[PDB]
């Protein structure tokens, strides 16, 4: 396969990317959510889609196993974006990285323990606040950690805040806003520009409203 390989993830990113792709003349021929398949053809025979864990999107793109991809800023910040090109803020799958803890609980007067998936983001943010912190690396369900005393705060993505509230937690600090971003393999950008360019211009045009 000699065309372009696009790396996406399930849920919000796939949902919200699909209209951008359609306007660029790319449509999936089935629902990837309902399939065990991994590589998907599209209406354009120069473009195929990988469905990955959101976490693996920047990895596949960096190594050139995908030519380009849609990844959240949270994931890009955590992974490091030094070896891909961020070309667009797609303004989709919008949320915030926040810190949070048990509602009205006081912070202990000592080095804080941060339970999070976003270990690099947690360390960098607390460094900006004057705090060297310990991080407990986790993989899901951060909202449980403070309820069983695993760490003093969490760092996680928050959209509505309903998860936090449901668990008697509240956001303490806003870290940054997060949205999905168009990333490109640094070599594919050079070698496959004529394939990429009309799709990038289409996306840019679509985002302009």
Ligand X SMILES: Nc1ncnc2c1ncn2[C@@H]1O[C@H](COP(=O)(O)O)[C@@H](O)[C@H]1O
**Residue ranges that bind ligand X, judged by CB under 6 A:** 12, 72, 93, 95, 156-163
- Pick one of ligand X, a copy of itself, none as the site partner of residue 159 (Cβ within 5 to 8 A by kind): ligand X
- Pick one of a copy of itself, ligand X, none as the site partner of residue 95 (Cβ within 5 to 8 A by kind): ligand X
Distance CA 152, CA 150 (A): 7
Short-list 202, 200, 196, CA closest to 4: 196
Dihedral, 169, 172, 175, 177 alpha carbons, nearest 10? 60
Nearer to ligand X, 44 or 179 (CB): 179
* Shortest Cβ 195–a copy of itself spacing (Å): 17
- Pick one of a copy of itself, ligand X, none as the site partner of residue 65 (Cβ within 5 to 8 A by kind): a copy of itself
Short-list 170, 123, 129, CA closest to 147: 170
Binding site for a copy of itself (CB under 8 A): 5, 36, 38-39, 50, 52-53, 55-56, 59-60, 63, 65-66, 136-141, 143-145, 147-150, 166-167
Distance CA 30, CA 27 (A): 9
CB proximity list for 205: less than 8 A, separation 6 or greater: 23
Q: How many residues are present in the chain?
A: 209
Nearer to a copy of itself, 21 or 50 (CB): 50
* Shortest Cβ 72–ligand X spacing (Å): 5
Nearer to ligand X, 20 or 196 (CB): 20
- Pick one of ligand X, a copy of itself, none as the site partner of residue 53 (Cβ within 5 to 8 A by kind): a copy of itself
Contact of 73 with 169, CB cutoff 8 Å: no
Contact of 133 with 116, CB cutoff 8 Å: no
């Amino acid at each position: 396969f000699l065309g372009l390989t696009l790396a996406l993830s399930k849920g919000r990113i796939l949902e919200e990317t699909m209209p951008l792709l359609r306007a660029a003349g790319v449509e999936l021929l089935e629902d990837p959510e309902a399939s065990r398949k991994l590589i998907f053809p599209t209406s354009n025979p120069n473009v195929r889609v990988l469905i990955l864990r959101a976490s693996d999107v920047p990895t596949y793109v960096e190594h050139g196993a995908a030519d380009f991809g849609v990844a959240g800023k949270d994931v890009l910040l955590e992974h490091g974006a030094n070896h891909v090109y961020e070309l667009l803020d797609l303004k989709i799958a919008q949320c915030k990285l926040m810190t949070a803890g048990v509602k009205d609980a006081p912070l202990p007067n000592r080095r804080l323990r941060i339970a999070t998936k976003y270990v690099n983001v947690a360390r960098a943010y607390f460094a900006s606040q004057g705090q060297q912190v310990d991080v407990i690396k986790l993989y899901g369900s951060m909202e449980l950690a403070p309820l069983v005393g695993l760490g003093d705060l969490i760092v996680d993505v928050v959209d509505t805040g309903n998860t936090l509230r449901a668990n008697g937690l509240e956001a303490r600090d806003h870290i940054c806003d997060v949205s999905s971003r168009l990333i490109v393999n640094q070599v594919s950008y050079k070698r496959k520009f004529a394939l990429l360019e009309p799709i990038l211009d289409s996306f840019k045009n679509s985002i302009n409203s």
